[PDB]
Design a protein around this ligand. Structure first.
Ligand code: G3P
Ligand code: CA
Ligand code: NA
Length: 259
């Protein structure tokens, strides 16, 4: 049902990150309240091997810390402020309750929502953080998450998704595509994506009616990122995408009602 081509999915990009600091429990809670179908997680691995949720490989942008995630322990990362950066970046959206928000672990996110959320979880190329895929899988099993569609695994790395498809054939994967990858996409490339992935997630800027219909022609779900503008939401849905990654899940929830 969640994986039905005829279902339009709201994927809350790093949670309700248009309103709340990205990849915090509060961002995910807000996305839930806004009726997002999926909350979206990016994984990094700490020095002591723990999976945390963070978009960048470095702490710099979204915390009061500095340096690579993999050079720091979980304990030190849990001391950081992962909310104040948002108040500084977006003064007009700032809220006092964002000061002191924490970096969550994957464990903390699964524990917080259990089966009450659907998870859209990004892995890296296998060489980046050895053991990440296996640890992710074991965490999903711990929380009894492995309803097909309860969890989708996404990556820019084909190798990662191929590996995941090997280990857990019934675990839906989505191939992420950069703009220039999508720009030069072929039918040959799409048909093999279908062999391990249930969908494609391209930079929406690279989409047009033609390659949208082409992607859909291979029975692939289609979730472009990152779609924040109402005018773009409408255009992409009329073209035939089956969902979006958005920072504004309430807005997309409203728009998609007409499609
Ligand atoms: O957020 P970006 O810019 O890394 O684009 C990928 C989206 O998160 C979809 O995974
Ligand atoms: Ca992502
Ligand atoms: Na900072």
């Amino acid at each position: 049902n969640l994986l039905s081509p005829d279902r339009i999915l709201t994927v809350a990009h790093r949670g309700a990150s248009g309103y709340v600091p990205e990849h915090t429990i509060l961002s995910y809670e807000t996305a839930q309240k806004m009726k997002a179908d999926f909350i979206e997680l990016d994984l990094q691995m700490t020095k002591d091997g723990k999976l945390i949720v963070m978009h960048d490989e470095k702490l710099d942008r979204t915390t009061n810390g500095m340096g690579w995630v993999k050079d720091h322990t979980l304990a030190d990362i849990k001391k950081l402020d992962a909310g104040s950066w948002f108040n500084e970046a977006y003064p007009e959206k700032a809220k006092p309750q964002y000061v002191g928000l924490k970096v969550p672990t994957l464990e903390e996110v699964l524990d917080r929502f259990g089966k009450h959320a659907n998870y859209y979880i990004e892995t890296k190329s296998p060489d980046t953080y050895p053991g990440m895929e296996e640890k992710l899988i074991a965490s999903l099993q711990k929380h009894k998450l492995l309803k097909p569609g309860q969890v989708i695994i996404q990556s820019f790395s084909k190798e990662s998704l191929v590996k995941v498809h090997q280990l857990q054939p019934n675990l839906p994967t989505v191939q992420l595509l950069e703009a220039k990858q999508m720009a030069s996409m072929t039918d040959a490339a799409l048909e093999e994506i279908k062999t391990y992935a249930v969908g494609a997630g391209p930079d929406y800027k690279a989409l047009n009616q033609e390659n949208v219909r082409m992607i859909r022609s291979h029975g692939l779900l289609l979730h472009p990122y990152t779609v924040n503008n109402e005018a773009d939401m409408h255009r992409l849905l009329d073209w035939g995408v089956t969902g979006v990654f958005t920072n504004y899940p309430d807005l997309f929830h409203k728009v998609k009602k007409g499609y």
